Amino acid sequence: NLSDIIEKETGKQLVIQESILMLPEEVEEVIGNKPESDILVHTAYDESTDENVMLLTSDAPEYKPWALVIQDSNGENKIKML
Amino acid sequence: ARPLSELVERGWAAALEPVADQVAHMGQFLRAEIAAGRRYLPAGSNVLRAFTFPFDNVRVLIVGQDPYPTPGHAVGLSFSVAPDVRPWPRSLANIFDEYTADLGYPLPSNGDLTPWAQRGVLLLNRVLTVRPSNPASHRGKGWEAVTECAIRALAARAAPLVAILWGRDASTLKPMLAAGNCVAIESPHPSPLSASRGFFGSRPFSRANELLVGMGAEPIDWRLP
Numbered sequence: 001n002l003s004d005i006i007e008k009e010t011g012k013q014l015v016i017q018e019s020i021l022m023l024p025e026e027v028e029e030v031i032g033n034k035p036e037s038d039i040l041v042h043t044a045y046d047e048s049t050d051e052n053v054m055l056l057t058s059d060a061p062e063y064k065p066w067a068l069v070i071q072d073s074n075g076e077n078k079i080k081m082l
Numbered sequence: 083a084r085p086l087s088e089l090v091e092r093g094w095a096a097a098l099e100p101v102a103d104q105v106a107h108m109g110q111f112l113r114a115e116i117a118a119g120r121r122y123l124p125a126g127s128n129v130l131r132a133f134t135f136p137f138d139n140v141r142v143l144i145v146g147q148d149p150y151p152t153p154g155h156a157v158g159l160s161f162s163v164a165p166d167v168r169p170w171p172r173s174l175a176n177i178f179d180e181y182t183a184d185l186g187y188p189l190p191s192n193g194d195l196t197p198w199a200q201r202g203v204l205l206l207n208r209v210l211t212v213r214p215s216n217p218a219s220h221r222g223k224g225w226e227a228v229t230e231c232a233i234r235a236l237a238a239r240a241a242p243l244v245a246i247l248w249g250r251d252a253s254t255l256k257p258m259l260a261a262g263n264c265v266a267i268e269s270p271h272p273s274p275l276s277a278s279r280g281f282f283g284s285r286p287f288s289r290a291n292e293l294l295v296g297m298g299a300e301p302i303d304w305r306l307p
Contacts, residue, residue, distance in 0.1 A: 016151070017155070017169070017170070018150060018151075018172065018173050020173060022251070041275045054275055060219060
């Protein structure tokens, strides 16, 4: 899966439940890196750490990793650019 | 099947009449997709389910994107999942928090949104189908033309409409409902990455209602536990 690259960068067997598509303008504000073109925000949930695990990739055909975000019970994000 | 009237509530028949050729085409695409060995997720019966509830009874539009890419999740309606779906889409989780925050209500027992649908909240995705595990795989594949006509038709009616538009993808449809009797309320997407950026606190369920009332229409119930 594309979820394998999640398992790679974090080591957690999680299922991607949603891929929301957003514009660079939207993603930039939160991560502080304006990306090339639109991004898909694949969000899986870790039901044990209560973390939202996010994988941001390039649009549909080629799902190119771009950044990874882990978001805790509070809302702070450990952002790792990919 | 084939003829529109046999496929959607009628009234929706009228609505989508101009995209009849366009929708009929979508069929042989899907059929062609199975023919080529791959399957699509939304599920035969449910693909057009969005348009099974009365056209004249819609008061609130919640436009989504394409369907949830994982099997057994997508159910023919924006954002909603199937009741057995346990750890639910984080977008939906967030939507729900703002939902308990906004209205007095307790957290829903499941992400089954059917009741909203049958109360005049149109949960229309912009792209009605999608290849399993391959998000956005049916974008520009013909569907937008349909969902777009869907919307224009709603806007044209004498009846008042509130469209709530989560994410910028949605916003592109703002112009598409000339705000005569239509009001659009936009906000960042309920996705975790963006939710706290201005979705949370947007109070869309009540605002939607108050807007409806402002225009001499009945409020939606919401409320699903």
